[PDB]
From a paper:
Here, we study fold transition between distinct β-barrels by protein engineering and structural biology technique. Here, we discover that the previously reconstructed ancient DPBB sequence could also adopt a β-barrel fold named Double-Zeta β-barrel (DZBB), as a metamorphic protein. The DZBB fold is not found in any modern protein, although its structure shares similarities with RIFT and OB. Furthermore, the reconstructed OB fold could also be converted to the four-stranded SH3 fold by a simple circular permutation. Thus, these ancient β-barrel folds (DPBB, RIFT, OB, and SH3) could be readily interconverted by a few feasible mutations through the missing-link fold, DZBB, indicating their significantly close evolutionary relationships.
Design-1 exhibited the metamorphic property, adapting two different folds, DPBB and DZBB. Different ligand molecules probably induced the metamorphism in design-1. In the crystal structure of the DPBB-fold, two malonate ions bind to a positively charged pocket around the α1 helix, and are coordinated by Lys24, Arg27, and Lys33. Alternatively, in the crystal structure of design-1 with the DZBB fold, two additional residues, Arg21, and Arg18’ from the other chain, coordinate the two sulfates. The sulfate ions may attract these two additional residues in the folding process, and then stabilize the inverted β2-strand in the DZBB-fold. We also found that high concentrations of sulfate ion (≥1500 mM) increased ANS fluorescence. Its spectral pattern was slightly different compared to malonates, perhaps due to the difference in the DPBB- and DZBB-folds. The changes in the CD spectrum patterns depending on the sulfate ions were also observed. These experiments demonstrated that the small ions mediate the folding of design-1, and their types may lead to two different structures.
Residue numbers in the entry:
A (entry chain A), B (entry chain A): 1 to 43
């Protein structure tokens, strides 16, 4: 269905874990900043 | 609008960068594995 998540800053602890990278240009495209709620959906 | 991205494994280089964490249970909920295309949308 969909995942409700938050944009975060990757920490040392996150290495090796699954993530979706969102760079600054992608963040400007969708209008998000660290801490914002986003929806992650399979294509 | 929306961001088209891929589930990845966070590397050492990703520390300090913005990401959306998707743990195994979230991955089972949406049906994704590392390498899969997902859409990231602002709420």
């Amino acid at each position: 269905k969909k995942v409700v998540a938050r944009v975060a800053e990757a920490r040392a602890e996150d290495v090796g874990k699954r993530v979706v990278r969102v760079d600054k240009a992608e963040r400007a495209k969708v209008g998000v900043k660290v801490g914002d709620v986003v929806e992650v959906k399979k294509v």
